[PDB]
Write a protein that binds this ligand. Structure first.
Ligand SMILES: CC(=O)O[C@@]12CO[C@@H]1C[C@H](O)[C@@]1(C)C(=O)[C@H](O)C3=C(C)[C@@H](OC(=O)[C@H](O)[C@@H](NC(=O)CBr)c4ccccc4)C[C@@](O)([C@@H](OC(=O)c4ccccc4)[C@H]21)C3(C)C
Ligand SMILES: Nc1nc2c(ncn2[C@@H]2O[C@H](COP(=O)(O)OP(=O)(O)OP(=O)(O)O)[C@@H](O)[C@H]2O)c(=O)[nH]1
Ligand SMILES: Nc1nc2c(ncn2[C@@H]2O[C@H](COP(=O)(O)OP(=O)(O)O)[C@@H](O)[C@H]2O)c(=O)[nH]1
Ligand SMILES: [Mg+2]
Ligand SMILES: [Mg+2]
Lengths: 67, 440, 426
């Protein structure tokens, strides 16, 4: 009975520690996955805007050639 | 020992926290400067009210509370308000840019910039506790901070405090006082994310409180102040067992043992009586029988649903004031003969009763009449799942068109988090169906 | 607090911009010299949204005045409230745009855009927590149309996580004779669909019809048309300027009004509107939902509402406002999409406008806005069919493909509004 009493409380400790550990990892995965997604969306936005800047220089370069 | 830390998140949580702590001070005789002339224990003590108030050497009784919002204008009113000396500046935490009614901004983009500071301040309160019992988290479902930041905090609290109990007071959205179309989204997101981190959550339907203020208090267009003063009375009834002591006083954790038959089934239905105006109370002394009967009128519930169309798994009566067991037992006996109270077949059918002798009080200049006795019923009924169903239906209507989803995706979230959260709610509704089916 | 940076470009932009700053300066108790002389602390509670506080307790508009010719900006400086603006925020050229979108967007406008960005950064760096920008301009001209959309894209590069909001004036042959306006408007809308978060469509055809038909103005002037814009611009920014719960900032307004990124073109409305030679909460509500009161030439009963914001101003029964707003939604449920529940939000502000005791401002995202774009598309394709006046634009370096792509993008915008108008729940 003494060894069963020790296995019960060891199980309780292991269950609580596992809940803490898995909650800590899931949250660290969500925050990292969210950081990558938001940065990727801002990167695509700027790349589209920079595509507009090169087009404005090709327009200015095209006007200069026809002079 | 047995300290409770309160955490008020977002505008709803902060403003409801204002009404609760004002009501607590009036119930305990604590002045706006924090002084309590009745407390002869200077600098400390193990009195029942010390579960919610710490004590300084100068005799100041300080709420064990943290206020956090992602914008400063609401907490700024606390900083300059009537009870500004009650709190230390470190307990009032603000950012500069709110979550814009966007769960993603509260849980991620904006919330992640302040979450460590919030946990640091919570740790400071916990270090003053000789035997911390758990946390009470006040927040709205619909706001970006109340939904997104709360779930982030609850996740972090499970990590830093293990299985220490965490109770919620959650503000369920209503169209009459709603400020965002995406409130069904934020509600489902935060309910799914918080579900496994909350031990017990008391939902407060703003439309139910709205109707009660119009119907019972003759208020034409209730304001947040009208709603919050009623909500604080219900919060007071629930926490009164923690803050006062008595022979017939039953601890909230003991009610909790009966209310939560499975971890996910942890949403009690609250019903409060009496809600009566001063003009109507002047004639009437409402007896124990009358306020107990009112607990089973669906118009007095904090969540709109029909318990007659569900099954009960628990029924608790929390009395306060001039109430003795003899009158309670007589009133319950009359209720059981004339009322539709069906229990699931796998749990006892008795009512668990608690009595706090300290009579209720009201804030000066309010609408609630001061009564000699009151009662809050806490029941676990499958009917509360109707509140999830109404939210889930509005979620489904918008999400089928991906309406407003781009605001969440733009802040880093994925559509998979929406479907995952919605399936968890579907399973939760299904869990409430299964627990109500008779055994075989 | 939460500062907005205001920018006005071109003749029309500086015209409606100056009127906007006069109306709100009066509401906040700011005189032409920048000093406060009001009588209510509600006027100063959120004054930081649009005004800086300089030395001597002066309040300076956080505004930037841009044009490719000094003419309009000289009249603003010598206008009624010209002294209130910061003289360093006047950025003007000399060459002019000649009502040429290419000149404003690619050549003369791009020569001045870096000078405008320098004063934007100075204003933005001085912000406790910048929330975004608002731009007033026309789509039919050259500077506000071409250089305005250029400023939008350049600012969005440096402030990509901030809100971009515009008051865009749509061209109409009832007001302007210039033939190349359908070209400038289509090229500008092509930019607004991509780079702004919310746009108020100030349709000059609606302003003319309101002045002519409703106000009995036989010969509507630009002062007349701009009188409606100032009342509308004061209304749609009340929630940003006074303490309130609903749509209190640009991002919360966008989250409530924009269910899909590209469909961010609002139909503004005002009530009451009656001629000078001639009120209850039910009448305010009916008028604000009436087509005659819309600042966009669109009948909302020809489409369906995605979202609506309604702001009531003045002392009135909130219970009555709640009843009438529920009443008009239930009686007209066919014109609100069922798959966006509770899509009509209502705010009440105690302080009325100057002349009226009760008013109502309407902000609607309706699929009937396609009628406005179909009108511009029909005028565009009538000229691009015969390649009329293209040499003004190819002479600046543009190719025909840019015109085709702008026509296809606006045609797609119309199809999107029709797709969601035809969408059902069951
Ligand atoms: C606004 C408004 O109600 O306009 C009408 C029009 O239909 C309305 C109904 C009115 O009752 C009627 C008819 C008035 O009879 C009233 O005596 C009266 C007011 C209240 C004046 O407006 C005010 O004083 C307001 O406080 C106002 N500020 C300004 O307009 C000064 Br920039 C404001 C409104 C909203 C938000 C901020 C500020 C305007 C007006 O000329 C008259 O309009 C016009 O003739 C007009 C002509 C062309 C374009 C637009 C309007 C007016 C005058 C005559 C002075
Ligand atoms: N009962 C009650 N409900 C409130 C109160 N304040 C806000 N709400 C409700 O809360 C929801 C809106 O969320 P808020 O708490 O105001 O928003 P928030 O938590 O501050 O989050 P963000 O402002 O978006 O950053 C709506 O359903 C409101 O009706 C209040 O003081 N009392
Ligand atoms: N409502 C209104 N429209 C204007 C005003 N000034 C110009 N417009 C319109 O703007 C278009 C011409 O654009 P404009 O402002 O002259 O171009 P820009 O100055 O070169 O940027 C025409 O369709 C006009 O009807 C004004 O003060 N009020
Ligand atoms: Mg908030
Ligand atoms: Mg012009």
């Amino acid at each position: 009975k003494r060894e069963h009493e020790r296995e019960v409380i060891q199980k309780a400790i292991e269950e609580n520690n596992n809940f803490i550990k898995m909650a800590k990892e899931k949250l660290a995965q969500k925050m990292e996955s969210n950081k990558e997604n938001r940065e990727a969306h801002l990167a695509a936005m700027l790349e589209r805007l920079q595509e507009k800047d090169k087009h404005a220089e090709e327009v200015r370069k095209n006007k200069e050639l026809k002079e | 020992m047995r300290e409770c830390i309160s955490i008020h998140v977002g505008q709803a949580g902060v403003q409801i926290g204002n009404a609760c702590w004002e009501l607590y001070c009036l119930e305990h005789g604590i002045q706006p400067d924090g002084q309590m002339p009745s407390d002869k224990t200077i600098g400390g003590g193990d009195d029942s009210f010390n579960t919610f108030f710490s004590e300084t050497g100068a005799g100041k009784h300080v709420p064990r509370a943290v206020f956090v919002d992602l914008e400063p204008t609401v907490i700024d009113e606390v900083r300059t308000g009537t009870y500004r000396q009650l709190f230390h500046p470190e307990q009032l935490i603000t950012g500069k840019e709110d979550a814009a009614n966007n769960y993603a901004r509260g849980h991620y983009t904006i919330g992640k910039e302040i979450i460590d500071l919030v946990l640091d301040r919570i740790r400071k309160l916990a270090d003053q506790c000789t035997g911390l019992q758990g946390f009470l988290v006040f927040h709205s479902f619909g706001g970006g901070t109340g939904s997104g930041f709360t779930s982030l905090l609850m996740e972090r609290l499970s990590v830093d405090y293990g299985k220490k109990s965490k109770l919620e007071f959650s503000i369920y959205p209503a169209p009459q006082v709603s400020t965002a179309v995406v409130e069904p989204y934020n509600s489902i997101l935060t309910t799914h994310t918080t579900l496994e981190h909350s031990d017990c959550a008391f939902m407060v339907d703003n439309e139910a409180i709205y109707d009660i203020c119009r119907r019972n208090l003759d208020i034409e267009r209730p304001t947040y102040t009208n709603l919050n003063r009623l909500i604080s009375q219900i919060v007071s009834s629930i926490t009164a067992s923690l803050r006062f002591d008595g022979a017939l006083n039953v601890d909230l954790t003991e009610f909790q043992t009966n209310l939560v038959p499975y971890p996910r089934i942890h949403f009690p239905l609250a019903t409060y009586a009496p809600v009566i105006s001063a003009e109507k109370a002047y004639h009437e002394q409402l007896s124990v029988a009358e306020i107990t009967n009112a607990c089973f009128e669906p118009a007095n519930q904090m969540v709109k649903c029909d318990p007659r169309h569900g099954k009960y798994m628990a029924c608790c009566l929390l009395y306060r004031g001039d109430v003795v067991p003899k009158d309670v037992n007589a009133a319950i006996a009359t209720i059981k003969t004339k009322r539709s109270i069906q229990f699931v077949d796998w749990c006892p059918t008795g009512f668990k009763v608690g009595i706090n002798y300290q009579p209720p009080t009201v804030v000066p200049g309010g609408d609630l009449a001061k009564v000699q006795r009151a009662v809050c019923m806490l029941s676990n009924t499958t009917a509360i799942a109707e509140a999830w169903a109404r939210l889930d239906h509005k979620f489904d209507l918008m999400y089928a068109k991906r309406a407003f989803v781009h605001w969440y995706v733009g802040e880093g979230m994925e559509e998979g988090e929406f479907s995952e959260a919605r399936e968890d709610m579907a399973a939760l509704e299904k869990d409430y169906e299964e627990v109500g089916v008779d055994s075989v | 607090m939460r500062e907005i940076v205001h920018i006005q470009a071109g003749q029309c932009g500086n015209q409606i911009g100056a009127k906007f700053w006069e109306v709100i300066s009066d509401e906040h108790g700011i005189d032409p010299t920048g000093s406060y002389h009001g009588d209510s602390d509600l006027q100063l509670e959120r004054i930081n949204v649009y005004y800086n506080e300089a030395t001597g307790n002066k309040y300076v508009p956080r505004a930037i005045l841009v044009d490719l010719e000094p003419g309009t900006m000289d009249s603003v400086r010598s206008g009624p409230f010209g002294q209130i603006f910061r003289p360093d925020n006047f950025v003007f050229g000399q060459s002019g745009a000649g009502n040429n979108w290419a000149k404003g967007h690619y050549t003369e406008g791009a020569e001045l855009v870096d000078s405008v960005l320098d004063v934007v950064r100075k204003e933005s760096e001085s912000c406790d927590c910048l929330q975004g920008f608002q731009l007033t301009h026309s789509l039919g001209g050259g500077t506000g149309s071409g250089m305005g959309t250029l400023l939008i894209s350049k600012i969005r590069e440096e402030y990509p996580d901030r809100i971009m909001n515009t008051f865009s004036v749509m061209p109409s042959p009832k007001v302007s004779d210039t033939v190349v306006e359908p070209y400038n408007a289509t090229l500008s809308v092509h930019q607004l669909v991509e780079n702004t978060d919310e746009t108020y469509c100030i349709d000059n055809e609606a302003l003319y019809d309101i002045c002519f038909r409703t106000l009995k103005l036989t010969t509507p002037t630009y002062g007349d048309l701009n009188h409606l814009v100032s009342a509308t611009m004061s209304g749609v920014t009340t929630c940003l300027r006074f303490p309130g719960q609903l749509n209190a900032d640009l991002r919360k307004l966008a989250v409530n009004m924009v269910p899909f990124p590209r469909l961010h073109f609002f139909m503004p409305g005002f009530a009451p509107l009656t001629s000078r030679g001639s009120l209850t909460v039910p009448e305010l509500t009916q008028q604000m939902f009436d087509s005659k009161n819309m600042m966009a030439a669109c009948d909302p009963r020809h489409g369906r509402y995605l979202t609506v914001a309604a702001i009531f101003r003045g002392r009135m029964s909130m219970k009555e406002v709640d009843e009438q707003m529920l009443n008009v939604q239930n009686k007209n449920s066919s014109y609100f999409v069922e798959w966006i529940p509770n899509n009509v939000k209502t705010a009440v502000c105690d302080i009325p406008p100057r002349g009226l005791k009760m008013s109502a401002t309407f902000i609607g995202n309706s699929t009937a806005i396609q009628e406005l774009f179909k009108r511009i598309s029909e005028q565009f394709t009538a000229m691009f069919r015969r390649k009329a006046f293209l040499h003004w634009y190819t002479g600046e370096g543009m190719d025909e493909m840019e015109f085709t792509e702008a026509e296809s993008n606006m045609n797609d915008l119309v199809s999107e509004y029709q797709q969601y108008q035809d969408a059902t729940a069951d």
